[PDB]
Design a protein around this ligand. Structure first.
Ligand SMILES: CCCCCCCCO[C@@H]1O[C@H](CO)[C@@H](O)[C@H](O)[C@H]1O
Ligand SMILES: CCCCCCCCO[C@@H]1O[C@H](CO)[C@@H](O)[C@H](O)[C@H]1O
Lengths: 206, 119, 208, 118
């Protein structure tokens, strides 16, 4: 009966709220330099579905992570094309909001093509839009609009997420949908971005 | 005085109604809700987009923090977007959540707000 | 800018310098003389010789003042500025030449479908002013745009004669023809219709 | 480093607008970029500005003329936003659009050459 999934919740309280609105919630555990095996281990126990979130990692950390942690969903968020491309080539499960901190979508037709080939999804996050000024919001939306176009054209896996860092960042599924609509998606497409597609991405962890 | 007359069933504005709930620790008055909705619309949709979407607070119940906001029939997702981008008002953090949408106020109440004691 | 393209007319300039500027961008300019007590038959007659095409502008007039003007000055264009439906109604019935932005200082288009047909029956036109929009704050501008959008729908449907104008009261209020046209587009007009509101329709109004 | 120009079918479809600023005061390129973004944001909102994609290509303080890009389908909305500007940094001004073209080259040749452009 239509299951909705939040692919990127990064906070305890947020998780509690998300679980009340989404059938499934993936908790992303952020890491900068090293992947705390202990922390990550305890995370899976408390939540169940956990993703390793590499925040602007260096290629080595990416290769190393996908090398001995493939069993865990792997997310990469960075504003560096080099890392973005490499992360996609390495086969991470998703690239999250590459446009953040860039003056472009952080993706083109070449990278989009590479993502569909390497089974890598693009994550459209709401959070950057919540606390940014008017100028920033306008640009973020412009880039997200272009990213959507590329994703649609090349059939790249995609999902809408709050990428919540606090309970206050979380939004109801049908509201998250409106974000998709505003950036160019049809209602059916936005719905799939928080149900059908999340399902496909999580498939691998079978 | 002599207010204008309604308007033919083809020129008359077509509307949809949104039922919403405000999640927060602090309370809000009917006036604050009217103000925060106009404020977000003007920022997110601009003066032009606001004139197109025509956001209009029908009623807000401070007790349950639920309410009804009207919008042009064809731009409901844009108003839902403006509401979603709200994070705080008058120093109080909040989350606006849309409960449902309908073509009429009576139907909206029956399926989404009766539960909150609207009737 | 003065012959090659379409003849553009500014039906509502209310300032000397505005006029001078408008005369550089519009082929023809109509200067409005504002009267809110009596129609100074003097300044009105002299102003007509300094600008050429002139019109009497009555702001918040008394039904009595309107009746007197529509007669004594059947040779002048008479414009009416009122946020009073009663005064708006009467002005339409008396055959005045145009109602200017009835929505100003109101909470509605200042015109419904019945007045829209009454205007068409009395040949009264509807003027859409840019000025109110210029000086309004965000909230005010949104409301004005909504009212104007509705006004346009009524006018387009019932084929009411209409025109866009700067209603300039100062040099800085004037806008180039093609730019003024965007106001019409934004409120609902197709480019071809917006252009018509500052050329074809003004003609008809001046036809008399 | 550097994304690749998207295929003609996916690339943005733009229109370039030549304009002139009428005023007693002077304006720098920075002031013009700011007033355009300020007006677009107020008139069109964050969402509308994202759709219109206004972008100052170049401004010439000497002749007070410049080029501003816009999404092809929404030129009239930027034109409107520009028209609602009346004062910036304490200086009254009127923006006048001179013309439009699908390319910068053609825009200049047609409306800015007379101002000494290129
Ligand atoms: C802030 C003001 C917003 C006004 C609503 C504009 C809606 C136009 O928006 C467009 O609608 C098209 C559907 O025909 C979609 O295909 C486009 O992707 C979308 O950008
Ligand atoms: C700033 C963002 C602007 C987005 C453009 C939204 C256009 C939808 O707006 C509509 O356009 C129609 C023209 O086809 C007009 O006739 C309608 O009156 C108008 O409401």
């Amino acid at each position: 009966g239509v299951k909705f999934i939040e692919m990127d919740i990064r906070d305890k309280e947020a998780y509690e709220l998300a679980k009340e609105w989404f059938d499934e919630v993936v908790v992303s555990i952020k890491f900068n330099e090293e992947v705390d095996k202990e922390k990550l281990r305890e995370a899976r126990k408390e939540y169940g579905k956990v993703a390793i979130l590499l925040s602007n990692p260096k290629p080595s950390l990416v290769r190393d992570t996908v090398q001995k942690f493939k069993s865990y969903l792997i997310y990469v968020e960075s504003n560096d094309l080099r890392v973005i491309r490499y992360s996609i080539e390495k086969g991470v499960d998703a690239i999250i909001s590459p446009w953040v901190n860039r003056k472009d979508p952080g993706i083109d037709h070449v990278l989009a093509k590479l993502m569909v080939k390497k089974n890598v999804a693009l994550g459209f996050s709401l959070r950057p839009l919540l606390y940014s000024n008017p100028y920033e919001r306008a640009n973020l939306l412009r880039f997200m609009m272009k990213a959507w176009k590329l994703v649609e054209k090349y059939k790249v896996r995609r999902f809408l997420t709050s990428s919540a860092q606090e309970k206050w960042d979380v939004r109801y599924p049908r509201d998250l949908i409106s974000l998709g609509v505003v950036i160019g998606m049809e209602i059916p497409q936005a719905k799939a971005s928080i149900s059908m597609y999340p399902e496909i991405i999580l498939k691998r962890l079978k | 005085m002599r207010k204008l007359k309604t308007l033919p069933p083809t020129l008359r504005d077509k509307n949809r109604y949104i039922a919403f709930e405000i999640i927060s620790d602090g309370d809000f008055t009917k006036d604050e809700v009217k103000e925060l909705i106009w404020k977000s619309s003007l920022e997110v949709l601009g003066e032009t987009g606001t004139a197109i979407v025509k956001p209009w607070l029908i009623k807000f119940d401070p007790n349950t923090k639920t309410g009804i906001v009207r919008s042009d029939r064809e731009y409901v997702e844009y108003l839902r977007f403006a509401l979603m981008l709200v994070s705080e008002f008058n120093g109080k953090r909040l989350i606006i959540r849309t409960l449902g949408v309908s073509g009429t106020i009576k139907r909206l109440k029956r399926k989404f707000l009766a539960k909150y004691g609207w009737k």
